[PDB]
């Protein structure tokens, strides 16, 4: 089931013998032990799934012309109300922090109490109403798509952060500088990304 090799000709790693998304990657032998791998495989899918939603968010704000992902929480210091598609949601800052904690604590706690190692990664029933998981072939194939797309969101959400710190420009504007003048507008010409430029 090996999707490929990150380094063709590299030595096979037996700890990743048959899993979804195997590329024989691990060079630091993290995951040598069998029990820790089940935890990492759980952490990867959840660090994935949170990134994919958060990534489409930052694009959704800028694509639809609403504003920046960075300036979204700035209403608190100014005092104005937040908005969602300019609807003027009324809740206050202390109300968000209270509902978020109690809601997610109920959710995360129920997840940890599963004690079914396969369903801790890939639940069923209510979390998939339409029933794509019934077909084992497409299920096995769609798992590679969940993981390949997810690793793009994670590495790239980091890019939204790193791009912002060196240059305060937003996402789509920072891209336009590459397309307008690629060789001049790069991370090397930031003056902060590389010491000594």
Partner 1 sequence: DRPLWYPGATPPAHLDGSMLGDYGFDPLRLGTNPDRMKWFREAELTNGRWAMAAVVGILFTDVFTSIGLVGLPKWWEAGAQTYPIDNQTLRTLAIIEFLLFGWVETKRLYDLRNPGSQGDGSFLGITDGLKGTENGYPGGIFDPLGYSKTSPEKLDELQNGRLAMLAFLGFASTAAVNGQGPIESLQTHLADPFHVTFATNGVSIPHFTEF
d(CA 26, CA 12): 10
Q: How many residues are recorded in the chain?
A: 197
- Give residues with Cβ within 8 angstroms of 159, minimum separation 6: none
Decide if residue 11 touches partner 1 (CB under 8 A): yes
Which residue lies nearer to ligand CLA by CB, 3 or 76?
Answer: 3
Least separation in angstroms between CB 44 and ligand XAT: 8
Q: Is residue 42 a known part of a binding site?
A: no
Triad 22, 38, 109: Cα angle to 5°: 130
Which residue lies nearer to ligand CHL by CB, 129 or 195?
Answer: 195
Which residue lies nearer to ligand CLA by CB, 61 or 174?
Answer: 174
d(CA 47, CA 55): 12
Cα torsion angle, 40, 42, 46, 48, sign: positive
Decide if residue 74 touches ligand XAT (CB under 6 A): no
Which residue lies nearer to ligand XAT by CB, 69 or 170?
Answer: 69
Choose the contact partner of 166 out of ligand CHL, ligand XAT, ligand CLA, none; CB within 5 to 8 A by kind. ligand CLA
Q: Is residue 157 a known part of a binding site?
A: no
**Nearest alpha carbon to residue 75 among 98, 143, 52, 84:** 84
Decide if residue 7 touches partner 1 (CB under 8 A): yes
**Nearest alpha carbon to residue 192 among 164, 159, 160:** 164
Decide if residue 50 touches ligand CHL (CB under 6 A): no
d(CA 95, CA 103): 12
Q: Is residue 44 a known part of a binding site?
A: yes
The residue sitting closest to ligand CHL, measured at its beta carbon, is 4
Residues annotated as binding site for all-trans-violaxanthin? Answer: 26, 28, 58, 69
- Give the binding site for ligand CHL (CB under 6 A): 4-8, 23
């Amino acid at each position: 089931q090996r999707a490929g090799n990150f380094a063709p000709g590299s030595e096979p790693k037996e700890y990743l013998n048959d899993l979804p998304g195997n590329f024989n990657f691990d060079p630091l032998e993290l995951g040598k032990e069998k029990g820790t791998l089940q935890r990492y495989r759980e952490a990867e899918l959840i660090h994935c799934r949170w990134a994919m939603l958060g990534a489409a968010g930052c694009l959704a704000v800028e694509v639809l012309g609403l504003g920046n992902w960075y300036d979204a929480p700035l209403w608190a210091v100014t005092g104005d109300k937040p908005t969602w598609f300019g609807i003027e949601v009324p809740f206050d800052i202390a109300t968000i922090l209270g509902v978020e904690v109690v809601a997610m604590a109920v959710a995360e706690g129920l997840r940890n109490d599963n004690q079914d190692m396969e369903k801790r990664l890939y639940p069923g029933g209510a979390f998939d109403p339409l029933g794509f998981s019934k077909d084992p072939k497409s299920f096995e194939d769609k798992k590679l798509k969940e993981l390949k797309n997810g690793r793009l969101a994670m590495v790239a959400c980091l890019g939204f952060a790193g791009q912002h710190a060196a240059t305060g420009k937003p996402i789509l504007a920072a891209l336009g500088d590459h397309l307008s003048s690629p060789f001049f507008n790069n991370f090397a010409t930031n003056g902060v990304s590389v010491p000594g430029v």
